[PDB]
Design an enzyme around this catalytic site. Structure first.
Site, PDB file in Angstrom:
ATOM      1  CB  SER A   1     -59.914 131.660   4.256  1.00  0.00           C
ATOM      2  OG  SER A   1     -58.558 131.526   3.903  1.00  0.00           O
ATOM      3  CG  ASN A   2     -63.339 136.616   4.767  1.00  0.00           C
ATOM      4  OD1 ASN A   2     -62.247 137.169   4.920  1.00  0.00           O
ATOM      5  ND2 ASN A   2     -64.137 136.872   3.741  1.00  0.00           N
TER       6      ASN A   2
ATOM      7  CG  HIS B   1     -61.585 134.111   0.076  1.00  0.00           C
ATOM      8  ND1 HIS B   1     -61.082 135.020   0.980  1.00  0.00           N
ATOM      9  CD2 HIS B   1     -62.932 134.284   0.078  1.00  0.00           C
ATOM     10  CE1 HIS B   1     -62.076 135.713   1.509  1.00  0.00           C
ATOM     11  NE2 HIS B   1     -63.210 135.294   0.969  1.00  0.00           N
TER      12      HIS B   1
ATOM     13  CG  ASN C   1     -56.552 134.452   5.015  1.00  0.00           C
ATOM     14  OD1 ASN C   1     -57.278 134.980   4.169  1.00  0.00           O
ATOM     15  ND2 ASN C   1     -56.632 133.159   5.332  1.00  0.00           N
TER      16      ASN C   1
ATOM     17  NE  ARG D   1     -59.224 139.041   2.556  1.00  0.00           N
ATOM     18  CZ  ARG D   1     -58.806 137.925   3.146  1.00  0.00           C
ATOM     19  NH1 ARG D   1     -59.669 137.130   3.789  1.00  0.00           N
ATOM     20  NH2 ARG D   1     -57.519 137.601   3.087  1.00  0.00           N
TER      21      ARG D   1
END
Lengths: 165, 548
Positions: B1-2, B23, B269, B297
């Site tokens: 996840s962002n 995500h 994350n 990320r």
């Protein structure tokens, strides 16, 4: 006199906009709209969360989380024991009880009327009326995804030693 | 996840802005679903939710937008039990032998003949919770066993918590509502409001041990390996009680990371630590947040976010739709130098050509260089000391970087890794000329829709996870519900997609429509006001009722 009522508008791509005067009616619209799009998915995941996969599908299949049906069933039978569901329900506010009551009613209303237009699993024995306990089962399944849920296989595998060296 | 929240000091319009990019699986019990909920006068919220939940999980309202990312905090602990030497079904606490509890579960099983048989299985439990076995690591022998205590098993507040979030007016209100209830099971929360506040909260349900208990109650070798393991033979290693906590044994809200800023906050994350590097969050329990090297990320996001230039909606959108493989920034320049040093090595010719032509992206049209790079990286990641610049805690945004090609041993091993990766790729049945979009797809009826994006571990912000199915890579999870929110004068402007479409049913008119849009990376308006909703040419309406 009031009961359950909802107004639903759908915009492009099938996104529902649900209007109601209370949580019960809001839940009703949500459950109905979700069923229209995803009745079979919810029915499958409720079977999983009830620990009834092996009963409908045998031991050679898996859940959508890729656990074998029997170990999955043992885990969710353990997780979602009656005492645990009862305690969870008892701890809910009136508003949340009403949301859940409405959702179940709205899902079931769609099921009663469905003629297969958007439902591929029509006629399957695991497609059936749901109860608020089923929604509690789903909630608890998601609750433990960051904890004991990651150890479901490990819980099923745990047995005391015999007389080995 | 962002997730990225931007505040008044960095947004182009001087207001709040939020990018939500969770995500999650493309099927099953965690498949997101879009909906808008209104009880006139007191609730009006839109976003996406998980199956079976009558609340919005990620969404926005008139003045607020919020989202979630999976956090790094522990939400359970293991307890190592000291078994009674006379009886492996008993365990010692404070030198006293306690019996395990046995609870049988009965399961019905459908057989070949179609008849049901009953299976009865014993589940052993300790005062901490059920016993668990990982063969070869967490065994149950005559000396020890392991039990698991899940902090969310007693979290009856979880639905109430999102019901409450759904009613939140702004960032300050959201924070109050979350800290009050502490019902969030295992995610961070990030948010922005119209006034230009950006909020990060590591506010979830986390086992609590007072600081002076942790060195004594930890199992050193297991915690060093990432497991939250405690000494189960000492009653003092019970989770600590603090009357301020909403649940007995969990960490009170005051001891969980929160950052309120007006420039930005982000998470992909990693821990709370570098949510915004200008204000590092440190000094928390190891169960909560640790200062670990960040993944690619987050490193990618920070590289775009730091600086003095205004952030536009299109900026955040394109951080997703660029499909940039950020890991390439760290290793591809030096890898290409190695390629140039080994012309004449026929076995490396095709791979080096592909890597050189590659746009360093996971786009539909990205060349075979992506596949070569992935297979190389997988092998690179298992090498020892191959980084030119190792991770440096004082340079955590710019390290690790480069390949240590000036160390002969590293040079040899990296070349081998490329050689190995090249052969593997060329051993596959993938036709020459194939592009990424030819390979990675999502099946809809008789068609395979090409899906852009790639694995998050390679630093692709648009993280997509796939598995081999016959001749192709079938998407199983990743970018899911996308929501990008700003707050112009007329009302919230929300833009995005549900990548896998509203309906899991092939019969539905809404089975593949957003998936085709996702393939083309064409995000759409999320209509929220009555006027937006009425402007929709395909608007449908149904009113329903029944007696209670």
């Amino acid at each position: 006199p009031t009961g359950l009522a909802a107004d639903i508008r759908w915009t492009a791509y099938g996104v529902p906009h649900i209007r109601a005067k209370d949580e019960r009616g809001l839940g009703y619209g949500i459950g109905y709209a979700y069923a229209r799009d995803n009745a079979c998915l919810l029915a499958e995941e409720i079977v999983t969360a009830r620990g009834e996969r092996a009963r409908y599908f045998g031991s050679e299949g898996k859940s959508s989380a890729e656990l074998d049906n029997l170990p999955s069933d043992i885990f969710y039978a353990w997780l979602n024991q009656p005492e645990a569901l009862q305690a969870f329900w008892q701890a809910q506010t009136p508003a949340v009880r009403q949301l859940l009551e409405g959702y179940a009613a709205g899902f079931n209303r769609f099921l009663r009327e469905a003629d297969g237009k958007t439902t591929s699993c029509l006629g399957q024995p695991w497609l059936r009326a749901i109860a608020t306990d089923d929604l509690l089962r789903l909630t608890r399944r998601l609750l433990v995804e960051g904890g004991v849920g990651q150890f479901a296989d490990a819980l099923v595998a745990a047995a005391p030693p015999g007389a080995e060296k | 996840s962002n997730a990225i929240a931007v505040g008044s000091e960095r947004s182009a319009d001087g207001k709040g802005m939020l990018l939500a990019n969770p995500h999650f699986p493309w099927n099953g019990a965690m498949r997101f679903y879009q909906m808008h909920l209104t009880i006139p006068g007191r609730l009006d919220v839109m976003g996406a939710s998980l199956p079976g939940l009558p609340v919005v999980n990620i969404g926005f309202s008139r003045h607020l937008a919020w989202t979630h990312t999976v956090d790094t905090s522990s939400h359970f602990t293991l307890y190592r039990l000291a078994l009674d030497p006379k009886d492996p079904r008993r365990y010692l606490v404070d030198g006293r032998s306690l019996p395990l509890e046995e609870k049988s579960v009965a399961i019905e099983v459908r057989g070949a003949d179609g008849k049901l048989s009953r299976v009865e299985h014993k589940v052993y439990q300790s005062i901490y919770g059920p016993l668990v076995v990982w063969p070869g690591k967490l065994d149950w022998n005559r000396s020890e066993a392991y039990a698991l205590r899940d902090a969310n098993l007693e979290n009856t507040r979880v639905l109430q918590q999102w019901y409450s979030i759904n009613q939140a007016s702004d960032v300050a209100d959201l924070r109050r509502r979350v800290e009050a209830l502490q019902g969030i099971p295992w995610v961070n929360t990030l948010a922005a409001d119209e006034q230009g506040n950006a909020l990060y909260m590591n506010q979830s349900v986390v086992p609590y041990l007072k600081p002076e208990l942790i060195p004594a109650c930890a199992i050193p070798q297991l915690v060093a390996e990432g497991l939250p393991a405690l000494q189960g033979q000492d009653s003092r290693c019970a989770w600590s009680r603090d009357p301020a906590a909403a649940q007995a044994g969990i960490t009170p809200a005051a001891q969980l990371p929160v950052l309120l800023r007006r420039d930005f906050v982000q998470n992909s994350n990693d821990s709370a630590w570098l949510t915004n590097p200008a204000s590092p969050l440190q000094g928390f329990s190891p169960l909560v947040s640790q200062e670990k090297p960040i993944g690619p990320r987050a490193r990618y996001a920070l590289s775009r976010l730091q600086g003095k230039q205004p952030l536009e909606a299109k900026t955040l959108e394109e951080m997703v739709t660029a499909n940039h493989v950020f890991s390439a920034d760290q290793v591809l320049p030096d890898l290409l130098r190695l390629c140039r040093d080994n012309q004449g090595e026929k076995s490396l010719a095709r791979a080096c050509a592909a890597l050189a032509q590659w746009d360093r992206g996971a786009n539909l049209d990205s060349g075979s260089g992506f596949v070569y790079f992935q297979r190389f990286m997988q092998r690179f990641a298992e090498l020892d000391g191959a980084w030119k610049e190792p991770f440096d805690a004082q340079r955590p945004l710019d390290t690790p970087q480069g390949i240590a090609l000036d160390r002969p041993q590293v040079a040899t091993q990296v070349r081998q890794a490329l050689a190995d990766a090249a052969a593997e790729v060329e051993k596959s049945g993938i036709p020459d000329g194939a592009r990424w979009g030819d390979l990675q797809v999502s099946t809809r009826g008789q068609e395979r829709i090409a899906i852009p994006g790639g694995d998050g571990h390679f630093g692709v912000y648009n993280a997509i996870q796939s598995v081999r199915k016959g001749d192709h890579l079938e998407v199983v999870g990743g970018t899911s519900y996308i929501q990008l929110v700003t707050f112009p004068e007329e009302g919230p402007k929300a833009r995005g997609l549900l990548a896998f479409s509203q309906s899991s049913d092939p019969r539905s008119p809404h089975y593949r429509d957003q998936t085709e849009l996702f393939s083309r990376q064409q995000w759409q308006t999320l209509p929220f006001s009555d006027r937006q909703i009425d402007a929709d040419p395909q608007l449908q309406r149904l009113s329903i009722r029944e007696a209670a």
